[PDB]
Ligand SMILES: CC(C)CN(C[C@@H](O)[C@H](Cc1ccccc1)NC(=O)O[C@H]1CO[C@H]2OCC[C@H]21)S(=O)(=O)c1ccc(N)cc1
Ligand SMILES: [Cl-]
Ligand SMILES: [Cl-]
């Protein structure tokens with residue numbers, strides 16, 4: 001419905017992100033504490049982490065202080081990389097771009 | 104009205120005569136609640152998240168109260184680690200995501 005993708009949540013709230021100079025599709029996800037992206041190379045050091053969701057847990061690599069643009073908004077923060085079914089923008093970066101849930 | 108996302112967006116819901124805590128989740132297509140009984144008919148469904156699929160019972164035309172707002176829709180019931188209010192019902196309480 002109302003445009004990015006979409007504001008009233010009748011369609012998935014999908015946006016384009018840019019990370020490591022590549023464009024990807026991601027979901028704005030208020031139910032995600034953390035941002036999680038499919039396998040890709042990121043600079044710097046990382047640390048393993050397991051995170052859980054509906055189905056159980058997956059091991060991810062945690063990269064801190066990564067520059068990522070989200071729907072045109074610049075953010076710099078933690079990105080988890082692993083076998084997620086969807087690229088997810090979680091609250092750690094939603095707060096950086098000033099996203100709010102209103103109702 | 105406006106929920107910041109510095110913490111998890113948790114609300115109280117009333118469903119099937121009980122009160123529960125649930126997460127307002129724009130990343131969820133569907134509402135999924137921990138095991139409970141609901142009246143009427145249901146059919147089995149599989150739903151996938153991070154870390155694979157779980158089997159749930161799909162109940163249609165269930166009335167819920169979310170933070171005070173009544174709504175009706177499908178509710179999936181099964182071994183989810185968190186009660187999640189998905190877009191199918193967020194739309195019914197006029198939730199929007201703004202930035
Ligand atoms: C992965 C998404 C595309 C979909 N998920 C909703 C999502 O909001 C879950 C919702 C969620 C929340 C807690 C536990 C399980 C699932 N969040 C999630 O997995 O976040 C993980 C990354 O950050 C961490 O903080 C939250 C858990 C971790 S889902 O729970 O798997 C899901 C799938 C299908 C339906 N119909 C409803 C929900
Ligand atoms: Cl976008
Ligand atoms: Cl962060």
Ligand SMILES: [Cl-]
Nearest residue numbers: 175176177191
């Ligand atoms: Cl529905």
Ligand code: NA
Nearest residue numbers: 143144163164
């Ligand atoms: Na029913």
